[PDB]
Amino acid sequence: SFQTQHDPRTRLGATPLPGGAGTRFRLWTSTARTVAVRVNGTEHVMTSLGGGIYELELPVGPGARYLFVLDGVPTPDPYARFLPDGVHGEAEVVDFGTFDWTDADWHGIKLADCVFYEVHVGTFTPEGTYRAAAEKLPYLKELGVTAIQVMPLAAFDGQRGWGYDGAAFYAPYAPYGRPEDLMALVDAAHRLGLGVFLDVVYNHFGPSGNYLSSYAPSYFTDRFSSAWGMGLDYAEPHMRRYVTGNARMWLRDYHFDGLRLDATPYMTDDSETHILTELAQEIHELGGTHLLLAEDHRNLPDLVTVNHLDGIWTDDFHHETRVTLTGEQEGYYAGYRGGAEALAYTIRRGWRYEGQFWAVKGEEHERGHPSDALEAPNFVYCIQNHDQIGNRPLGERLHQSDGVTLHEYRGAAALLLTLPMTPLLFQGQEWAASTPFQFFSDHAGELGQAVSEGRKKEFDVPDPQAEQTFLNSKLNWAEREGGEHARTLRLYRDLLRLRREDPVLHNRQRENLTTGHDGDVLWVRTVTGAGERVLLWNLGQDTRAVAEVKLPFTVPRRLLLHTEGREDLTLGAGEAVLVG
Ligand SMILES: OC[C@H]1O[C@H](O[C@H]2O[C@H](CO)[C@@H](O)[C@H](O)[C@H]2O)[C@H](O)[C@@H](O)[C@@H]1O
Ligand SMILES: OC[C@H]1O[C@@H](O)[C@H](O)[C@@H](O)[C@@H]1O
Ligand SMILES: OC[C@H]1O[C@H](O)[C@H](O)[C@@H](O)[C@@H]1O
Ligand SMILES: [Mg+2]
């Protein structure tokens, strides 16, 4: 008896009418005295319906260009479905009924079957478009990943950016392609049996191109702020519906299989039903198999067990792994010792901080909650993602940080890809890509100057506003064909094939997973009715024979995969082996 709050009849923005009758335009404003729509250059006064709702139907079709005029001020549509001239321009009317989907035999993907591959459309290919990305889908399928995780696509200002400055949440960013180019990418992925997930940002709007306050200041509150502006007021139903209607668009109209909710701790809501719960209700109402993930640092199981999200990006594993390999201690890295015994614990517990004191200077508090309720798929683990590369001054990848060997990098891959938690890889990780992933932006005027200045002060550091910073982050595909890039890629292919094929690694129960250490050797054991597997990773500086590792059980004898392809059960520094 949950009923969606959305009815296509009353949808805000511009929606094609049945029977070729044109387009229905609707908006909500709490303050405007005169309200019109300007379509293809012609102004038309809209009808006041009450409650600040205004509507007009005109015989214009998909492709018509428009914006709204509030007290005489031309104002972009916050509900725009496409913005061909960017965030300050006219919107285009879009009909989602026109695309010829071919994915009727695709039925989504379960979280326990996901191996995510995080793509930034702008840098993933030279062209930096959906069409060029779609051409790499056969590569990704053969690699062995199963779900692409696309960084945010809502239109933002400028000609490149990560996506977190999105301002028109319903409008796919024009430089990447038109709406039908995005649909083509999703359809192609589905035809290859790959899922596609979208990063959405429901805790803030970017600094340029968000005109919601022009319609109603009450979308936002002064009670709290975001990085860019006034906080999103989830006590206001139109604000709630702005994001739930957006989530439903991406899933239903673009056929995404799931959403990754950025920075869920900053979606503040004291309503009886939290906006996260309502998001889950609203997407479920669609009657599909779509998933919701939370990017959440609180180590809070309620995101799954109370808000009914499917899983959580949980950085403690990432951080413990990075500190193990570099020893770094700046910022949040000070929260971790690293090492075999530390990694064994963090894996055992899913996340490390379950209520203990987080002693990181400037952030001190009792962090986290017991992880017992969560099962292995609920934790999304990684050793690289956009933030853990890009939020470093030089945007360097794990194998490029001082002190990290390619052997250690390859061992880390074996640990991540044999665990029953849900793994994520960042584009290019699989071939030890040579290029960084730096923070880049392209804001106008003073705002652009402020971003450059802000980055300099924060931490030579690449200027985020420089074209070169964007280009330096482009993947170099050709390099994967040679040398250590190719060797790394072969290992990633072998690990992803084992993950898929090995009947014991199919385990998705923490009950069947145990961990421990002997000195600097980590061991991770899986026992099911199908057999036993043990991953051993030598995080020491010396060579360790498997036979000399002290274990509380009898080590399996058969060598299934060695990260440096050795024939014998011995681990050089940084190396790992899976036995069975
Ligand atoms: O060498 C001085 C540091 O030793 C420890 O850190 C090392 O050993 C950790 C495992 O116990 C590794 O995770 C880490 O990468 C190494 O740097 C100690 O934890 C540090 O406080 C010392 O400064
Ligand atoms: O973006 C998430 C990060 O926010 C940080 O400020 C926290 O220190 C850390 O726990 C988390 O990794
Ligand atoms: O201003 C009238 C009203 O507009 C709306 O219906 C908003 O949902 C409401 O919270 C506000 O009070
Ligand atoms: Mg020992």
Side-chain angles (χ1 to χ4, degrees):
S1 79
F2 172 80
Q3 295 193 64
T4 179
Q5 289 179 38
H6 294 283
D7 178 342
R9 173 54 185 79
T10 54
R11 185 179 290 170
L12 296 179
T15 311
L17 287 165
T23 298
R24 176 177 293 125
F25 294 97
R26 285 176 65 99
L27 65 80
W28 171 60
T29 175
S30 58
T31 58
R33 297 202 202 183
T34 64
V35 182
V37 57
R38 189 185 79 202
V39 186
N40 295 334
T42 295
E43 194 173 308
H44 304 262
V45 174
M46 296 176 72
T47 299
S48 176
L49 304 178
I53 301 298
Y54 288 76
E55 183 178 72
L56 194 72
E57 299 171 7
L58 293 166
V60 306
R65 298 302 298 278
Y66 71 98
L67 49 61
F68 293 116
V69 188
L70 299 176
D71 297 331
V73 182
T75 302
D77 182 11
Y79 295 85
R81 294 309 200 263
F82 194 57
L83 288 161
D85 300 320
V87 294
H88 307 293
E90 292 181 336
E92 181 174 338
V93 173
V94 171
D95 184 353
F96 295 124
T98 51
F99 187 85
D100 281 334
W101 292 101
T102 66
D103 62 349
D105 290 335
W106 171 256
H107 298 110
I109 186 168
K110 292 170 180 70
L111 190 56
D113 297 320
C114 286
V115 178
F116 293 114
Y117 187 92
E118 188 176 36
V119 168
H120 178 260
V121 176
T123 50
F124 183 58
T125 56
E127 300 100 313
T129 59
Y130 311 127
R131 285 291 174 168
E135 298 306 300
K136 310 296 186 184
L137 290 169
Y139 164 81
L140 292 175
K141 172 69 170 195
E142 186 72 24
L143 170 63
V145 298
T146 63
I148 300 152
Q149 169 59 62
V150 183
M151 291 178 63
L153 300 180
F156 50 92
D157 205 13
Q159 292 310 297
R160 58 262 180 200
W162 282 13
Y164 304 90
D165 294 334
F169 287 3
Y170 292 76
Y173 180 57
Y176 292 164
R178 286 184 55 76
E180 61 268 22
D181 295 314
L182 179 52
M183 295 178 287
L185 170 65
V186 175
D187 197 65
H190 288 174
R191 293 292 296 320
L192 293 172
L194 299 168
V196 191
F197 283 60
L198 180 68
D199 197 339
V200 296
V201 184
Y202 296 155
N203 58 84
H204 79 274
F205 288 85
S208 187
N210 167 26
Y211 288 90
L212 280 163
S213 60
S214 295
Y215 294 79
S218 57
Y219 276 108
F220 303 103
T221 182
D222 64 10
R223 183 184 317 103
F224 55 86
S225 303
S226 300
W228 293 121
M230 304 190 42
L232 276 54
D233 193 351
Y234 288 121
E236 169 47 56
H238 288 287
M239 184 67 255
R240 306 176 68 86
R241 285 187 293 266
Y242 183 92
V243 304
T244 63
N246 184 249
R248 291 167 58 89
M249 175 193 74
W250 292 125
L251 302 173
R252 174 194 56 235
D253 297 319
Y254 286 89
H255 290 209
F256 281 94
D257 297 296
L259 308 176
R260 173 244 190 227
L261 310 177
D262 186 60
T264 51
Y266 307 104
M267 295 174 65
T268 305
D269 184 18
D270 298 299
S271 305
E272 175 171 339
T273 290
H274 197 274
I275 185 59
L276 289 173
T277 304
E278 182 172 317
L279 272 160
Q281 293 167 317
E282 282 282 3
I283 68 106
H284 280 92
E285 190 277 346
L286 300 171
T289 62
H290 313 98
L291 308 174
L292 292 180
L293 300 177
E295 191 228 1
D296 200 283
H297 62 66
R298 296 174 288 174
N299 292 352
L300 176 58
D302 289 6
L303 286 161
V304 168
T305 61
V306 176
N307 302 123
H308 301 301
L309 309 184
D310 292 293
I312 305 169
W313 279 31
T314 56
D315 295 330
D316 286 349
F317 173 85
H318 168 277
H319 300 340
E320 197 88 65
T321 298
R322 175 170 263 281
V323 174
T324 293
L325 301 182
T326 66
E328 73 197 273
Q329 293 283 102
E330 305 311 306
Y332 48 80
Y333 294 111
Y336 309 81
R337 174 184 160 189
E341 180 194 336
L343 277 170
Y345 183 85
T346 294
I347 296 159
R348 188 167 311 117
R349 300 310 304 161
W351 48 56
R352 166 167 292 283
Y353 283 84
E354 294 184 271
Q356 302 89 353
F357 191 75
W358 175 251
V360 172
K361 284 176 181 290
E363 294 191 7
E364 298 92 334
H365 69 293
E366 295 175 307
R367 178 169 179 249
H369 298 84
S371 57
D372 297 52
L374 300 189
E375 186 50 290
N378 293 312
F379 298 88
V380 184
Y381 274 8
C382 63
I383 63 177
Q384 297 279 72
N385 70 31
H386 61 270
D387 274 331
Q388 305 304 328
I389 298 167
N391 299 324
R392 304 187 73 73
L394 303 186
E396 94 281 6
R397 291 170 179 261
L398 180 56
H399 53 114
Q400 316 179 299
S401 290
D402 287 338
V404 180
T405 74
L406 275 170
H407 292 192
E408 285 167 330
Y409 185 71
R410 285 197 284 254
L415 172 66
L416 176 65
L417 293 179
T418 62
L419 286 166
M421 282 72 161
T422 300
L424 173 150
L425 308 182
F426 187 71
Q427 59 179 33
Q429 176 175 330
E430 72 275 30
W431 73 77
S434 69
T435 44
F437 186 77
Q438 293 171 340
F439 181 68
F440 49 86
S441 55
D442 184 34
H443 284 294
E446 285 157 58
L447 175 60
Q449 291 171 327
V451 170
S452 296
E453 190 67 2
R455 193 76 181 180
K456 187 165 161 191
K457 286 180 218 194
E458 168 180 3
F459 300 102
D460 316 324
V461 169
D463 178 358
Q465 293 269 300
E467 285 171 342
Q468 193 65 50
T469 303
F470 170 58
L471 296 175
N472 288 348
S473 303
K474 292 271 190 185
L475 294 183
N476 182 325
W477 283 82
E479 73 192 1
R480 82 191 191 280
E481 298 182 273
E484 288 294 305
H485 299 297
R487 176 183 186 77
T488 299
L489 182 49
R490 289 192 295 279
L491 179 65
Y492 270 78
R493 291 194 173 114
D494 290 344
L495 283 169
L496 292 161
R497 177 175 181 166
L498 280 171
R499 187 181 181 87
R500 178 177 71 252
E501 292 187 345
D502 182 286
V504 177
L505 298 181
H506 289 175
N507 175 56
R508 292 293 189 274
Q509 294 158 75
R510 289 175 64 210
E511 173 175 6
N512 296 329
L513 183 72
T514 49
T515 62
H517 67 107
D518 171 15
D520 299 318
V521 178
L522 168 67
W523 61 259
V524 175
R525 185 187 193 203
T526 299
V527 179
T528 69
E532 177 177 23
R533 297 297 178 262
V534 177
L535 188 87
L536 301 99
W537 189 14
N538 180 12
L539 294 161
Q541 306 307 314
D542 64 349
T543 299
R544 293 284 164 167
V546 173
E548 298 150 49
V549 179
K550 300 185 203 161
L551 296 174
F553 53 89
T554 294
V555 77
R557 299 172 211 192
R558 174 174 59 113
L559 185 176
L560 303 181
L561 182 59
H562 190 295
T563 54
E564 300 303 323
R566 311 203 187 280
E567 300 175 354
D568 304 333
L569 293 175
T570 178
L571 300 170
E575 301 175 14
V577 67
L578 184 76
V579 293

